Amino acid sequence: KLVQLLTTT
Amino acid sequence: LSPEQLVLTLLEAEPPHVLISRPSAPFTEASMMMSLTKLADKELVHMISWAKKIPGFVELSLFDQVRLLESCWMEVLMMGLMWRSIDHPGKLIFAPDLVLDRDEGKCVEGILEIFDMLLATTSRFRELKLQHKEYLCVKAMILLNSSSSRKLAHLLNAVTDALVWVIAKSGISSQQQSMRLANLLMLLSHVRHASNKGMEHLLNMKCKNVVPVYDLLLEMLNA
Numbered sequence: 354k355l356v357q358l359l360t361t362t
Numbered sequence: 363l364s365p366e367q368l369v370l371t372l373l374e375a376e377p378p379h380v381l382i383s384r385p386s387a388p389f390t391e392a393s394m395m396m397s398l399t400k401l402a403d404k405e406l407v408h409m410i411s412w413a414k415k416i417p418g419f420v421e422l423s424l425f426d427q428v429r430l431l432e433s434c435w436m437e438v439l440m441m442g443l444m445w446r447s448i449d450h451p452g453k454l455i456f457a458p459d460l461v462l463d464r465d466e467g468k469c470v471e472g473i474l475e476i477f478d479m480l481l482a483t484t485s486r487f488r489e490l491k492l493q494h495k496e497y498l499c500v501k502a503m504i505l506l507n508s509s510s511s512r513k514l515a516h517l518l519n520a521v522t523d524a525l526v527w528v529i530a531k532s533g534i535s536s537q538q539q540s541m542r543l544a545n546l547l548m549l550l551s552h553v554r555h556a557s558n559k560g561m562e563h564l565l566n567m568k569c570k571n572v573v574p575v576y577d578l579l580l581e582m583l584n585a
């Protein structure tokens with residue numbers, strides 16, 4: 354969750 | 363990148379205004395925690411984007427970006443709450459459709475404690491007449507100072523340099539530029555304190571499953 358938002362725009 | 367331009371990019375990183383889509387009406391303990399958790403969850407999404415807009419942040423290791431956010435998120439939320447509440451003494455403007463009074467904090471056990479803390483710190487920033495640009499630098503520092511290593515210190519130093527600059531523009535005495543810098547930074551201790559308490563209270567609410575499951579919020583709360 355935190356990681357996917359940090360790797361997507 | 364000069365201090366002024368760095369401050370400008372922080373302004374451009376500002377998350378959008380958030381509402382919880384709740385028809386105006388009195389509050390209860392079940393609806394208050396419902397709204398507070400639902401709001402925090404939404405703001406958390408916008409906070410991630412905000413951080414990525416801070417020059418150099420996405421240049422940090424993935425391990426650092428995660429640990430920085432996981433440890434400071436509540437502080438950043440509460441710092442935002444205080445800036446929004448600055449021009450509304452005696453009120454905590456969590457959201458346009460979520461305005462709370464101190465007595466309303468009595469609907470939930472242990473939250474009145476945290477509200478007073480928030481109201482006090484807010485009142486403090488009010489006395490100092492916190493400026494928007496200062497709010498931008500301060501919030502940025504909270505994230506960067508809530509601990510690739512060198513890159514971080516470099517970034518933290520840049521933002522710190524931006525705060526000094528903002529203070530220098532106010533055109534006040536140098537001695538008063540120092541007094542103001544220290545007073546603004548000393549308040550971060552109170553924001554970090556109201557944060558730890560807000561987490562403890564929230565964690566306790568989770569363990570009791572009194573608040574719905576918000577994937578992002580749950581993840582951030584657990585670690």
Ligand SMILES: Oc1ccc(-c2cc3cc(O)ccc3o2)cc1
Pocket residue numbers: 398399401402405439440442443456473476560561563564565567
């Ligand atoms: O912008 C903000 C700032 C703070 C909160 C928030 C939710 C919440 C829940 C608790 O049990 C205790 C403290 C809290 O503070 C939510 C949004």
